[PDB]
Amino acid sequence: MIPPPEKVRMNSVNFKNILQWEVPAFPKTQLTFTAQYESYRSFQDHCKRTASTQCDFSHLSKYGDYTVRVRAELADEHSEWVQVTFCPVEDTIIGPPEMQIESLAESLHLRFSAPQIENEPETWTLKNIYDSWAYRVQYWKQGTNEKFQVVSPYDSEVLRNLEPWTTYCIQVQGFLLDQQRTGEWSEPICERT
Amino acid sequence: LLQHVKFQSSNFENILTWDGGPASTSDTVYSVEYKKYGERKWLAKAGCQRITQKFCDLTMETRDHQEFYYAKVTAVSAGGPPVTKMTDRFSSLQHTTIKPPDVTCIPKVRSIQMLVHPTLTPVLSEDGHQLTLEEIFHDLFYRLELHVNHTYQMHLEGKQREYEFLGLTPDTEFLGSITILTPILSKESAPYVCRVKTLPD
Amino acid sequence: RCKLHVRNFQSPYIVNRTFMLAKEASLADQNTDVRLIGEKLFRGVSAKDQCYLMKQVLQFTLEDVLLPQSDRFQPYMWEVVPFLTKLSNKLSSCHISGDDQNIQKNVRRLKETVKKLGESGEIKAIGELDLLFMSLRNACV
Ligand SMILES: *[C@@H]1O[C@H](CO[C@@H]2O[C@@H](C)[C@@H](O)[C@@H](O)[C@@H]2O)[C@@H](O)[C@H](O[C@@H]2O[C@@H](C)[C@@H](O)[C@@H](O)[C@@H]2O)[C@H]1NC(C)=O
Ligand SMILES: *[C@@H]1O[C@H](CO[C@@H]2O[C@@H](C)[C@@H](O)[C@@H](O)[C@@H]2O)[C@@H](O)[C@H](O)[C@H]1NC(C)=O
Numbered sequence: 001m002i003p004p005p006e007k008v009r010m011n012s013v014n015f016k017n018i019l020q021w022e023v024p025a026f027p028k029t030q031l032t033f034t035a036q037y038e039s040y041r042s043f044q045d046h047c048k049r050t051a052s053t054q055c056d057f058s059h060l061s062k063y064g065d066y067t068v069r070v071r072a073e074l075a076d077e078h079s080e081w082v083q084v085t086f087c088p089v090e091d092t093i094i095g096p097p098e099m100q101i102e103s104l105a106e107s108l109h110l111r112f113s114a115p116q117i118e119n120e121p122e123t124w125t126l127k128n129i130y131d132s133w134a135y136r137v138q139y140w141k142q143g144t145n146e147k148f149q150v151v152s153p154y155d156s157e158v159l160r161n162l163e164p165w166t167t168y169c170i171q172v173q174g175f176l177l178d179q180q181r182t183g184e185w186s187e188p189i190c191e192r193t
Numbered sequence: 194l195l196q197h198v199k200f201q202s203s204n205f206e207n208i209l210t211w212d213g214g215p216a217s218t219s220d221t222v223y224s225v226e227y228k229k230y231g232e233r234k235w236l237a238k239a240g241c242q243r244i245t246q247k248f249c250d251l252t253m254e255t256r257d258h259q260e261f262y263y264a265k266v267t268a269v270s271a272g273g274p275p276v277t278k279m280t281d282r283f284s285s286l287q288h289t290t291i292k293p294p295d296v297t298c299i300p301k302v303r304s305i306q307m308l309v310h311p312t313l314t315p316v317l318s319e320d321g322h323q324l325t326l327e328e329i330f331h332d333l334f335y336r337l338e339l340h341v342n343h344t345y346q347m348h349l350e351g352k353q354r355e356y357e358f359l360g361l362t363p364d365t366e367f368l369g370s371i372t373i374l375t376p377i378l379s380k381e382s383a384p385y386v387c388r389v390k391t392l393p394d
Numbered sequence: 395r396c397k398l399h400v401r402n403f404q405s406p407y408i409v410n411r412t413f414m415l416a417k418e419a420s421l422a423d424q425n426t427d428v429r430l431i432g433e434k435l436f437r438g439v440s441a442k443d444q445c446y447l448m449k450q451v452l453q454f455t456l457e458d459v460l461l462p463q464s465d466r467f468q469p470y471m472w473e474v475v476p477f478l479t480k481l482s483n484k485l486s487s488c489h490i491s492g493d494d495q496n497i498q499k500n501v502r503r504l505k506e507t508v509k510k511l512g513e514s515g516e517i518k519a520i521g522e523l524d525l526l527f528m529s530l531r532n533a534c535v
Binding site: 040061062063064065124128129130131132178 | 476479
């Protein structure tokens with residue numbers, strides 16, 4: 001028999017759904033893999049006898065509950081399947097939003113941009129799919145470890161009343177106001193007051 | 194002799210429009226009929242029967258923003274036969290565009306204040322009074338921008354009706370634009386745009 | 395015990411794809427005289443039973459029009475059908491504490507009208523997915 005794929009995972013961020021596996025411990029470098037998804041009663045081939053260690057599942061519906069499986073194969077004999085359960089809008093990772101800061105004077109003006117989703121040939125953002133999308137802002141200076149937080153549902157925010165001539169560094173993340181779902185933080189972008 | 198027969202709907206003001214053709218006689222007249230989708234009888238609008246103009250206000254006749262309707266225009270030509278073309282299924286809630294918000298810009302010495310006033314609409318509540326846009330779309334909000342030069346803009350957004358851009362230099366020209374957004378139905382008004390100048394202090 | 399959250403109807407994406415799907419089907423539907431999800435559907439259904447009525451119409455539309463009919467009206471059909479299915483499963487926990495002689499007769503009279511119109515009946519229901527979406531909203535929240 002053939003050993004099945006190892007460390008199989010669906011790497012999904014911003015609805016970029018990629019099923020990833022690793023080539024198994026096998027001293028014979030002749031090995032093909034085939035990946036499938038569920039279409040109602042029946043499975044659909046998506047990657048058929050590929051040499052690659054990944055398969056792109058971004059064409060899947062957001063609101064669809066899908067189960068994905070992959071096997072390594074050679075000749076007529078195949079491996080056991082390794083299945084994962086997967087629903088994009090519930091399970092994908094919320095990428096970090098983009099932010100620009102325009103500090104005029106004793107103020108910090110923020111502007112946000114939700115991550116764009118690759119499912120659609122149109123400019124859709126994760127904010128366009130989730131009905132409860134909002135931004136968490138976390139701010140501090142550069143000599144303190146202490147933090148402060150503000151939540152905003154709009155693409156703009158102004159941090160008002162702070163000490164002047166102090167460089168601040170801020171980050172933003174996506175989250176849902178009706179879920180316990182947190183998105184990934186951005187890296188702090190800093191602008192001087 | 195009849196073409197482009199359609200609804201043009203703004204803030205639930207629902208106007209029927211059509212155009213003549215390459216055969217539009219001197220005395221060519223148009224009659225409008227409307228009905229609610231799923232009805233057999235076509236109602237006749239009292240005003241727009243055998244009229245020479247090319248539009249008809251059906252606001253009172255399609256007042257239910259949650260309803261679906263149809264309208265048709267009958268063009269009769271001097272030489273003969275009549276042509277009747279109707280519109281696509283019309284839903285005011287889904288097809289209406291948003292008018293720019295009703296704003297007064299107030300120039301201040303070191304800031305710019307903006308007041309957005311409610312707009313009444315022809316759609317009524319159960320008790321029979323006219324609704325504001327805010328009353329129809331609970332998701333309505335205002336996005337304001339204050340443009341200085343290609344590289345610098347100030348932004349404010351919210352559900353409130355009072356906005357003030359703080360921290361400006363006196364005696365400076367700014368461009369303010371205020372936009373209504375309805376995200377759920379992906380509606381967006383054209384911007385209201387003020388050319389304002391902070392007072393010279 | 396049988397209500398949907400308003401949140402389920404407030405996704406700009408799903409609303410755009412549902413309404414765009416309904417418009418492409420309704421443009422090919424010139425039968426202005428007959429309306430499926432219309433007042434003939436709500437005849438003699440108390441308002442506390444109206445969501446269960448819409449529970450029956452949604453699963454009807456999924457099983458008899460949308461599942462056999464997944465082949466046309468793309469790309470919207472691909473995204474709307476998984477959304478509508480998620481709405482039927484939330485509603486499996488719905489059961490009327492009373493007489494459903496009016497709901498079953500009207501949902502059956504509906505299934506009869508779609509089938510007496512053959513294929514024209516199936517496109518009409520897809521052209522009425524905005525009415526289904528919005529009757530499901532107004533009936534279950
Ligand atoms: C459905 O979305 C279509 C695409 O618009 C995208 O989504 C918005 C939020 C924004 O990100 C934009 O940049 C994207 O392109 C949109 O075109 C469509 O409108 C319909 O088509 C246009 C051409 C007009 O005819 C309009 O009147 C139509 O309704 C959206 N439709 C609905 C019902 O929301
Ligand atoms: C663009 O404007 C920036 C912002 O400053 C603005 O301009 C001055 C005149 C004052 O009105 C101030 O209150 C405003 O915020 C400038 O910092 C920047 O240098 C300008 N750049 C160019 C290319 O014009």
